[PDB]
Amino acid sequence: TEYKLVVVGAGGVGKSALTIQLIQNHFIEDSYRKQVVIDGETCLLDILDTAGQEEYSAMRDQYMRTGEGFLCVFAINNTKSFEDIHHYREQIKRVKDSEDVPMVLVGNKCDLPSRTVDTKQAQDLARSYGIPFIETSAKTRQGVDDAFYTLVREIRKHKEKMSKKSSTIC
Ligand SMILES: Nc1nc2c(ncn2[C@@H]2O[C@H](COP(=O)(O)OP(=O)(O)O)[C@@H](O)[C@H]2O)c(=O)[nH]1
Ligand SMILES: *C/C=C(/C)CC/C=C(\C)CCC=C(C)C
């Protein structure tokens, strides 16, 4: 089953470090296909890190149109990046013309000792949007698989609910 995952969020939150951790297992390509088993389903993940494409209107429009699920990433040490989440969610909702888009809120760099965003205010925001919240470190790999696999589960849920031989001569 093919799932198209898009990683969005402010410059510097660890969107690239997260994608590279998931794919290559350590801490210039945009889009990558990785094959994985999740809850016993054989999955082909098409993952776009939006770091390069975000600044181009037509690219942004296109990855929001074709994207099936969105990791919305902020850094727990960057309040501005937490405030930016609502802008990303509002763009994705407008481009899809939908209220029901698979999304996971991700608070990255949880390995840092220097937090400026309370877990509670992130938990409250996720609840207000009706979406899962995951704390990750691309550095230590904490929560990384959980964050991507949760988003696959959200796309799976969305498809589960979303759901003639003819004659040419006659
Ligand atoms: N300590 C720590 N640093 C991180 C983490 N993720 C990314 N970084 C660093 O933060 C910076 C921005 O990462 P990058 O993946 O390029 O950000 P992007 O612009 O969102 O792709 C880089 O210097 C990374 O090494 C993390 O989980 N913990
Ligand atoms: C759907 C209509 C047709 C253009 C073809 C109908 C088939 C014909 C004339 C012959 C069929 C042959 C047998 C039933 C033996």
Numbering used by the authors: 2 to 28, 36 to 171, 179 to 185
Give sentences from the paper.
In contrast, the phosphatase INPP5E, which is trafficked to the primary cilium, binds to PDE6D with a reported affinity of ∼10 nM and it was described as a “high-affinity cargo”.31 Characterization of the INPP5E:PDE6D interaction identified two residues that confer high-affinity binding to PDE6D: an isoleucine in the −1 position and a serine in the −3 position relative to the carboxymethylated prenylated C-terminal cysteine. To test if the INPP5E high-affinity PDE6D-binding motif can increase the KRAS affinity for PDE6D, we used a fluorescein-labeled 13-residue peptide of a mutant KRAS HVR sequence, which incorporates the Ser-3/Ile-1 motif. While such high affinities are challenging to measure accurately, it is clear that the two-point mutations dramatically increase the binding affinity of KRAS to PDE6D, up to 26,000-fold, when compared to WT KRAS. To this end, we determined the crystal structure of the full-length KRAS S3I1 mutant in complex with PDE6D at a 2.2 Å resolution. The crystal structure contains two copies of the PDE6D:KRAS S3I1 mutant complex within the asymmetric unit, where each KRAS molecule binds to PDE6D in the same conformation. With the high level of conservation in the peptide backbone conformation, particularly of the surface-exposed residues, the high-affinity KRAS S3I1 mutant may serve as a surrogate for the KRAS WT:PDE6D complex. In this experiment, recombinant MBP-tagged prenylated KRAS(G12D) S3I1 mutant showed less release in the presence of excess ARL2.GppNHp or ARL3.GppNHp compared to MBP-tagged prenylated KRAS(G12D) with a wild-type hypervariable region [hereafter named KRAS(G12D) WT]. By introducing the KRAS mutations that increase the binding affinity to PDE6D, we were able to successfully solubilize KRAS(G12D) S3I1 protein and retain it within the cytoplasm. Nevertheless cotransfection of PDE6D M20K together with KRAS (G12D) S3I1 resulted in significant reduction of the phospho-Erk levels. Exhibiting a very slow off-rate, the KRAS S3I1 variant enabled an SPR fragment screen to be performed against the complex.
